[PDB]
Amino acid sequence: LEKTFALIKPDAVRAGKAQEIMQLIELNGFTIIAKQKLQLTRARAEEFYGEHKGKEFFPKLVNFMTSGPIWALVLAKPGAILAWRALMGPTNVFKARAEQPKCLRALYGTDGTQNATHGSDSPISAAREIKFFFPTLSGDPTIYAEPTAAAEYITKRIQPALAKALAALAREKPSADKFEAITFVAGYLLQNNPNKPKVLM
Amino acid sequence: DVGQALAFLQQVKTTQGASIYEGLKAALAKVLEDRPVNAVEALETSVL
């Protein structure tokens, strides 16, 4: 059982074809574990399409994805990535109509870049995009729980501020009650951190 | 390993006559067969 990312572009939404696509997706054995209708801004779209970053089609591609609300879906299936790649069919809409009819790109997609769907290529990009659009959707418990990778992540996170917080806790030595120490270290962390700034009125 | 947890969950008994393992299994079976509307809250409201 694997989870892939997918999104319905504004061309299949301005034509009111989103629900038909969702029903077709559910008919082929997929499961929509998470869905959200949203509207990307220019900066968010540019950050999402980082792999292209200045290619020939990038201007029109980023100008199109911010022309209306899209849908974002997380599909779940044993062969989700490959099966969804097949279900969408070939990227080029005219080549899709020629080769494989009765595919979502052939039916709903038109006019080249407006292929009416977007899917993930590999599990790396799938996980990256899922975390991009669903920050709180749990997943991938095997690629983060390696003792080497766990130690590496703890190393990346602790030197910035937690070591300093522990040093301050040891030097100040507040009430021996552990709850006060927990509160003090939490305040120190939420006050001193390299990622977020300090907020003042 | 998982064997320890499985062997442990079958000795512990709950307020009901069955073990906690069997109780959770029956709750999941009912949830899977019925497919309730708001399922997660139906676990605390309807199945148990």
Binding site: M22, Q23 | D34, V37, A42, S46
Partner: protein, 249 residues
Amino acid sequence: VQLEPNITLVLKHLASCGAVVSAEQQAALDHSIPIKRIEAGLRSLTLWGRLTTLNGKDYLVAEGYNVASSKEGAAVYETKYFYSQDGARWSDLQPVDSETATRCARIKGMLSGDPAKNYELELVFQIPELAVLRCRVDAIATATSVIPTDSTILNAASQVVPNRLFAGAAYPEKLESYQHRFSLPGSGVTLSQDLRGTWAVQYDAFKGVAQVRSLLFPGYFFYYAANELTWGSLYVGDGLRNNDLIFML
């Protein structure tokens, strides 16, 4: 959600589709359906339809049933039918034989209002009008009887009961949301495994109301209101299916 279809809801949502009943008949149904329901032991008894006649005394037909079992891989609802010329008094609609139904099938045009008429078929055969009416009603009932998919569910002792935890049919503007009552709840047979052009569906998304019209029998209508989660079906017209359907599509 609903336990039984409500007559006033059916008449209110099918008013556009042309399925209407007169004022006197409406009030008489309101006052007389419970009486006939309680006279028998039927847990359910509702208006089934209104067949048109030649003299002007339309046949009001109601059907009822007690319990809904599952038997030989299908939902077998043991039904009982009643008819009337006025909404007040309800008379039994006797079931017909097999060969009598085969002969029933050969009578066309609207049957007359008088239930004492006799039709002549061919060695000659005499066919009572009540037999013809029952033949037509059972034909329509067998052909088209819509309920939203998974609105019912099995239970202990294997009786098809309503599903009180019905979430609502998803994508209700498509025929995969509705099914014949005879189809078992678990099975995936729905209103899409029959002929491709014998059902029409209109949908209002803002009010969330779906209307399903049968084209094989142009008098059968069904509504599903999603916000209230209430569904109901009616028949208005003579019990004739249009065999010349293909030229119409």
